[PDB]
Design a protein around this ligand. Structure first.
Ligand SMILES: [Cl-]
Ligand SMILES: [Cl-]
Ligand SMILES: [Cl-]
Ligand SMILES: [Cl-]
Ligand SMILES: [Mn+2]
Length: 340
């Protein structure tokens, strides 16, 4: 049966099933006020699928100059063509190689650059913005988005959306690496998975993905979306409540010291965006500091809602295209205020 919603993370995460249900706000706002993330499924069924393919981005924009990041060692690959990234998105035989002769796991940095998405891709802009869930919160002029209504005493988000494009992590060693390291944002955000590319050449890579989800602490209902419904999993997230951010900073200062980093007692390991919490570190956070988070698998067409102030990290299972929009809900406006 069609149903309005269900629960993940053993009841701790709301999952809305109909992205355009006009009554979603009633269920959403109860969870959102408590500082929780929310998942909305099915957004891919609302979009023009031909606008979100890697081959179309390579054909239309392939001659632009860009920088990449090597996800395994954070090395910057400077001033290459964006087709050099797109043409290896799914075909492993076409990826840029490290010295060891292995194909690299790459992230496309700051593309489209700054606030230029709308100018560069006006048809993609319209398709996304007209189909975002919880539109009173998420549209630029929504009634419950305070972004355009606040004075300079508040940090306001840039004009969006922002595209996040990166290959999937592959090996057992890659299990400890982030696509996006642990960080927090002073605005709210909605992050939509618009394409998942499952490769070929080294295709048969299905089983290290299951051990990553299992060891990542994914709940039993989330494991059923793979095995029972054959949906395409894109990325494993860990999200922590904003109230737990200082306890996470205490753990990371202790670990940085144990690893011989030489840091002042007040430095901010979350703002530095230098850490990925692997299975060892997530268990230490729980046991030693009493902090529990949310382990979320984002499938094709899932929209993840990330509360302002909430520390979060992302680990791509397969090659992903994500598009995100920032907003300022009244529930979380305290996180962007510049005083006390
Ligand atoms: Cl809060
Ligand atoms: Cl476009
Ligand atoms: Cl709404
Ligand atoms: Cl990062
Ligand atoms: Mn973020």
């Amino acid at each position: 049966s069609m149903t309005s919603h269900s629960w993940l993370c053993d009841g701790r995460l709301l999952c809305l099933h109909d992205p355009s249900n006009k009554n979603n706000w009633k269920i959403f706002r109860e969870c959102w006020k408590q500082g929780q993330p929310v998942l909305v499924s099915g957004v891919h069924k609302k979009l023009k699928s031909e606008l979100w393919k890697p081959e179309a981005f390579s054909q239309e924009f392939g001659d632009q100059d860009v920088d990449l990041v090597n996800c395994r060692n954070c090395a910057i690959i400077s001033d290459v063509k964006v087709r050099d990234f797109w043409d290896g998105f799914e075909i492993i035989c076409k990826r840029l190689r490290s010295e060891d002769g292995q194909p690299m796991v790459l992230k496309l940095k700051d593309w489209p650059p700054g606030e230029d998405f709308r100018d560069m891709m006006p048809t993609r802009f319209e398709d996304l913005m007209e189909n975002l869930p919880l539109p009173e919160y998420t549209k630029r002029d929504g009634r419950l988005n305070l972004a355009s209504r606040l004075p300079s005493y508040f940090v306001r988000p840039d004009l969006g959306p922002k595209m996040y494009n990166a290959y999937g992590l592959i090996t057992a060693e890659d299990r400890r690496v982030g696509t996006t390291n642990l960080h927090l944002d002073v605005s709210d955000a909605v992050n939509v998975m618009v394409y998942v590319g499952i490769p070929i050449g080294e295709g048969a890579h299905d089983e290290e993905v299951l051990k990553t989800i299992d060891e990542g602490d994914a709940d039993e209902v989330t494991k059923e979306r793979i095995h029972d419904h054959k949906e395409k999993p894109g990325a494993l997230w860990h999200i922590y409540a904003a109230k737990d951010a200082e306890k996470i900073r205490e753990l990371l200062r202790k670990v940085g010291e144990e690893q011989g980093q030489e840091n002042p007692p007040d430095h901010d390991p979350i703002h530095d965006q230098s850490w990925y919490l692997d299975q060892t570190l997530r268990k230490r956070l729980y046991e030693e500091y009493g902090v529990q988070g949310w382990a979320i698998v984002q499938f094709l067409g899932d929209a993840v809602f990330i509360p302002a102030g909430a520390p979060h990290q992302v680990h791509n299972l397969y090659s992903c295209i994500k598009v995100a929009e920032d907003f300022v809900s009244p529930e979380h406006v305290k996180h962007c205020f510049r005083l006390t």
